[PDB]
Amino acid sequence: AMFVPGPYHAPEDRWLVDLVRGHPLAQLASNGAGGAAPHITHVPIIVDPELDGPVDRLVGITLWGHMNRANPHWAALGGAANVVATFAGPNAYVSPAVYRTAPAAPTWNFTSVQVRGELRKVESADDTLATVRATVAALESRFGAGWDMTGSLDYFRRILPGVGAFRLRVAEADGMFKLSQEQQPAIRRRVRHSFGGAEATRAVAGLMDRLP
Amino acid sequence: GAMFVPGPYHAPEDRWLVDLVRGHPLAQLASNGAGGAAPHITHVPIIVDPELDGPVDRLVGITLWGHMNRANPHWAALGGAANVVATFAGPNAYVSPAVYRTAPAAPTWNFTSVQVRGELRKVESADDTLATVRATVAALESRFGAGWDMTGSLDYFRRILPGVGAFRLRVAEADGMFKLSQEQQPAIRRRVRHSFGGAEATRAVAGLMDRLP
Numbered sequence: 001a002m003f004v005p006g007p008y009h010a011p012e013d014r015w016l017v018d019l020v021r022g023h024p025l026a027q028l029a030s031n032g033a034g035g036a037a038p039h040i041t042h043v044p045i046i047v048d049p050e051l052d053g054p055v056d057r058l059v060g061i062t063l064w065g066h067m068n069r070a071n072p073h074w075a076a077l078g079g080a081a082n083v084v085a086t087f088a089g090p091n092a093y094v095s096p097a098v099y100r101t102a103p104a105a106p107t108w109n110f111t112s113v114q115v116r117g118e119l120r121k122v123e124s125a126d127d128t129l130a131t132v133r134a135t136v137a138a139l140e141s142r143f144g145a146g147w148d149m150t151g152s153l154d155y156f157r158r159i160l161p162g163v164g165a166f167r168l169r170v171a172e173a174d175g176m177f178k179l180s181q182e183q184q185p186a187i188r189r190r191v192r193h194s195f196g197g198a199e200a201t202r203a204v205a206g207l208m209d210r211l212p
Numbered sequence: 213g214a215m216f217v218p219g220p221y222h223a224p225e226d227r228w229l230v231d232l233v234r235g236h237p238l239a240q241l242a243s244n245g246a247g248g249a250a251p252h253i254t255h256v257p258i259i260v261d262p263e264l265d266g267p268v269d270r271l272v273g274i275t276l277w278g279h280m281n282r283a284n285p286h287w288a289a290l291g292g293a294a295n296v297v298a299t300f301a302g303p304n305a306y307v308s309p310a311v312y313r314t315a316p317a318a319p320t321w322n323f324t325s326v327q328v329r330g331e332l333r334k335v336e337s338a339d340d341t342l343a344t345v346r347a348t349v350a351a352l353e354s355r356f357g358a359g360w361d362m363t364g365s366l367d368y369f370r371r372i373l374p375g376v377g378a379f380r381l382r383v384a385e386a387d388g389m390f391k392l393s394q395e396q397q398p399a400i401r402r403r404v405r406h407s408f409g410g411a412e413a414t415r416a417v418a419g420l421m422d423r424l425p
């Protein structure tokens with residue numbers, strides 16, 4: 001489980017799915033053997049592409065991911081590893097200068113999703129190639145420029161042996177939406193207004209604008 | 213090696229890892245879950261030892277300062293001398309093969325990461341807790357802030373202090389992923405760098421690519 005103070009809960013389950021879709025390069029964590037620090041790999045993870053219809057909740061759905069099979073994290077997972085995948089969205093430092101109140105302390109507004117469950121390794125070549133093609137389809141659509149993978153499928157197949165594809169059955173899903181909900185209404189407005197004025201912070205202002 | 217980093221994605225200089233830690237202080241702190249559970253992950257503000265003089269070129273051997281909420285189960289979970297990783301995530305951008313203008317190809321994600329490992333030591337004294345949060349204001353307000361003066365709030369910090377869980381992390385191992393199209397042919401790296409220079413969202417990635425030898 002993930003610690004999320006009451007005020008930082010998403011208004012709706014759909015916000016956690018939106019952050020996963022918007023920020024697919026997750027930090028995949030699993031336990032380190034013999035009391036060592038956890039293993040951490042940045043990996044591209046998407047929602048099950050076979051899910052037709054609105055996906056409102058992460059709990060009960062399967063995420064699809066891959067990493068490098070030669071990455072020692074792949075061997076360390078073994079068979080039924082309990083893992084967390086952390087998705088990190090828009091974030092910005094909050095200067096109390098923005099509050100125009102006193103006294104105060106600074107903070108950092110940020111967005112995260114933590115999904116936990118059992119990681120199963122894909123061994124099937126068909127399921128592995130489906131994983132990377134669904135990942136092209138999902139990320140090129142949201143982040144890309146209309147690139148057509150069709151002419152590169154032979155190439156995908158040539159490099160496929162190196163792919164460690166996986167499936168993560170989401171047992172638990174938690175979302176930090178730390179967006180100044182602890183402040184009084186006028187101060188939340190001052191913060192939202194200050195973040196509206198620059199590209200680095202507009203995405204945070206966007207989420208703050210959608211709070212009930 | 214505790215973090216997997218293909219040879220092409222090694223930083224040019226140890227200083228690049230220190231730069232990313234300074235630029236991206238909101239780290240993800242990870243420690244093992246009890247009895248096969250998944251790791252505990254908390255976003256925590258972390259800075260370089262403010263007492264360091266000289267140029268800081270290497271993370272290994274320096275102490276990082278940070279805090280978290282004592283009310284967070286992760287605080288009780290860390291117990292004594294917990295082995296932890298703190299991951300710092302810098303500039304990043306999806307790479308469309310449309311930018312490469314080459315075939316065949318596969319998309320990728322250019323990103324920067326630093327993973328530091330060592331033993332987390334808790335600070336229990338109020339005087340070391342207070343130092344931790346004051347040092348953190350001085351380091352972050354200067355770099356990310358808008359000229360706020362903490363002077364008027366110094367007693368306020370003491371009046372809201374018990375909830376702070378301050379810690380020290382002596383860096384035993386530091387690894388850095390600088391995934392910035394080094395695997396592509398030079399003409400293609402240039403195409404990605406020029407593409408990423410044409411939008412604010414991707415400019416920081418272009419800037420790192422421009423600083424590669």
Ligand code: HEM
Nearest residue numbers: 044067068071132135136156159160162163318319320321
């Ligand atoms: C669509 C976007 C994609 C992204 C963001 C992406 C991202 C990544 C990342 C971050 C890793 C490294 C994980 C680790 O450190 O262990 C990786 C490894 C790998 N991916 Fe993907 N991938 C994508 C599509 C593909 C496709 C379509 C293929 C086709 C087969 C592929 C083949 C590989 C291979 C072979 C590796 C092992 C490392 C290597 O030889 O380059 N990826 N991918």
Ligand code: HEM
Nearest residue numbers: 105106107108255257280281284345348349352369375376
């Ligand atoms: C300068 C930038 C600062 C940042 C970016 C920052 C960030 C954070 C974050 C992310 C947490 C939550 C950690 C968790 O989930 O366990 C935290 C907790 C906390 N911080 Fe800070 N902090 C800052 C400065 C301060 C200062 C100056 C104080 C003064 C006492 C302070 C007091 C606290 C307290 C009491 C908590 C416990 C939970 C709460 O009451 O919000 N912080 N801080």
